[PDB]
Design a protein around this nucleic acid. Structure first.
Ligand SMILES: Nc1ccn([C@H]2C[C@H](O)[C@@H](COP(=O)(O)OP(=O)(O)OP(=O)(O)O)O2)c(=O)n1
Ligand SMILES: [Mn+2]
Ligand SMILES: [Mn+2]
Ligand SMILES: [Mn+2]
Ligand SMILES: [Mn+2]
Length: 438
DNA sequence: GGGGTGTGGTAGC
DNA sequence: ATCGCTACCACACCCC
């Protein structure tokens, strides 16, 4: 048990934070792509016809945590009991629930108390601990399998549990659905054996947006092949609005009142005009949502195939800590700001870059929000503020960066005990070259 | 036109 | 108890 003002707080919070493990796994996957394909150039051109295999583990954490469960859960049955991965018993986020749990309508992200209340009496929720190293190991088996199979020209990290895999079809050869239906089976089986029992689902299409939607139609433990020539009302009607890329809870809300509450992608499909759509959710987002409702990708999304190196290169670096923030005085806020900058400088140095620009974001307790929110150590309800500072010459100096960071907090005006959350960023990054003379 | 900003949206949760 | 993390783009304005 470690308070925010203990020198050890950052290391411990990161050791238990599944969100931190997720972002770091993500980040390490993107660097290994940039080292593996440093002199390879098997990227996607417009001269290429390609198919997208979008591959993802079914209830990833839930599965790995069950497969590696301690002897205390030996009798747990993974297709018979609702299983969640979580820290706690009340206001603890469910990082992953199995599909037994999803029948009762439990979702990823809910709290244990909120998922328990949806089970009928006589049904027990099972809560497995996080198994972070096993998550990492299993993922490694997944990416090793994909590359070993020798059937993709580009393998794109999406996640600890996801990749977009591109196969180029030479125009001599002729692709068919039984050929496709059957790479899927090879992939699913090979990953199953390699992961010692984890299952993946695959969506397969001539577009990223259709492979994403197909992947969702395929889950659990299955695969869906849906090309643009296969589109039907039956397809669109099997999706809700935020199933679509580019649609989070706010865009979703905006669409639901500009178009008389569409309930399936088919509804939205038949009721929308491009121009009312732009005016409702924003023009660029609206042109992507319009493209997506036809199965076609956007130019912003296609870049990941044409220059995946430029897309997956890290253009900023940052930490976020919005849990357990309870400082009493400014001296403690500064020391923790200092310990954050040193951690970020460690990351900046491992990648041999400087930063031109930093940013501090913070969360401040809303004036009438309780000082302790329902969630233990939660941020509670907060307004956020941020400020940025452009540094003269790019640097990796702790003196300069930490001092400007503490000044950006001194400037935002937030009393130490109203602090509930901190974010520390390095924005513009420069590679350190061989010349360093003025 | 270019450059900047803080806020807010999506994505991967 | 409980561990609410990162990275990118879009936008509405301001500057020269
Ligand atoms: N709100 C969330 C969503 C996901 N995760 C973690 C746990 C997941 O196991 C992992 C992968 O995310 P996915 O979106 O792929 O969800 P799942 O793999 O758990 O289930 P599925 O993809 O079959 O729907 O990310 C989390 O911690 N909090
Ligand atoms: Mn998954
Ligand atoms: Mn996933
Ligand atoms: Mn959505
Ligand atoms: Mn997901």
């Amino acid at each position: 048990i470690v308070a925010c003002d203990d020198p050890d707080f950052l290391t411990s919070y990161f050791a238990h934070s599944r969100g931190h493990h997720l972002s770091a796994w993500k980040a390490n996957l993107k660097d290994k792509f940039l080292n593996e394909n440093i002199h390879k150039y098997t990227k996607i051109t417009d001269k290429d016809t390609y198919i997208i295999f979008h591959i993802d583990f079914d209830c990833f954490f839930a599965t790995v945590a069950y497969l590696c469960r301690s002897s205390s859960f030996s009798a747990c049955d993974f297709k018979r009991d609702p299983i969640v991965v979580c820290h706690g018993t009340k206001n603890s986020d469910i990082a992953s629930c199995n599909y037994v749990a999803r029948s009762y309508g439990i979702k990823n992200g809910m709290w244990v108390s909120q998922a328990e209340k949806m089970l009928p009496n006589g049904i027990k929720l099972i809560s497995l601990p996080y198994t972070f190293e096993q998550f990492q190991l299993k993922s490694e088996a997944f990416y090793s399998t994909l590359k070993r199979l020798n059937i993709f020209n580009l393998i794109l990290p999406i996640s600890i549990d996801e990749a977009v895999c591109v196969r180029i079809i030479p125009d001599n050869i002729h692709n068919t659905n039984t050929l496709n239906a059957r790479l899927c089976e090879e992939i699913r089986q090979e990953i199953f054996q390699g992961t010692n029992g984890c299952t993946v689902s695959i969506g397969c299409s001539d577009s990223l947006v259709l492979a994403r939607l197909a992947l969702k139609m395929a889950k659990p433990n299955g695969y869906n092949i849906t090309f643009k020539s296969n589109l039907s009302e039956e397809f669109w009607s099997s999706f809700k609005l935020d199933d679509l890329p580019g649609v989070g809870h706010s865009t979703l809300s905006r669409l639901e009142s500009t178009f008389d509450s569409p309930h399936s992608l088919n509804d939205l499909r038949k009721r929308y005009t491009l121009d009312a759509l732009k005016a409702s959710v924003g023009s660029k987002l609206g042109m992507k949502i319009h493209l997506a409702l036809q199965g076609q990708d956007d130019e912003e999304s296609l870049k990941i195939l044409y220059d995946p190196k430029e897309v997956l290169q890290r253009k900023s670096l940052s930490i976020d800590i919005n849990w357990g923030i309870r400082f009493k005085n400014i001296t403690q806020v500064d020391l923790f700001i200092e310990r954050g900058c040193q951690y970020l400088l460690e990351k900046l140095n491992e990648i041999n870059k400087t930063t031109s620009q930093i940013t501090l974001k913070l969360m401040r307790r809303c004036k009438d929000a309780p000082i302790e929110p329902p969630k233990y150590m939660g941020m509670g309800r907060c307004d956020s503020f941020s400020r940025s500072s452009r540094l003269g010459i790019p640097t990796n100096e702790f003196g300069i960066i930490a001092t400007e960071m503490k000044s950006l907090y001194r400037t935002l005006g937030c009393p130490p005990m109203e602090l509930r959350g901190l974010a520390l960023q390095f924005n513009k990054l420069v590679d350190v070259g061989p010349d360093n003379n003025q």
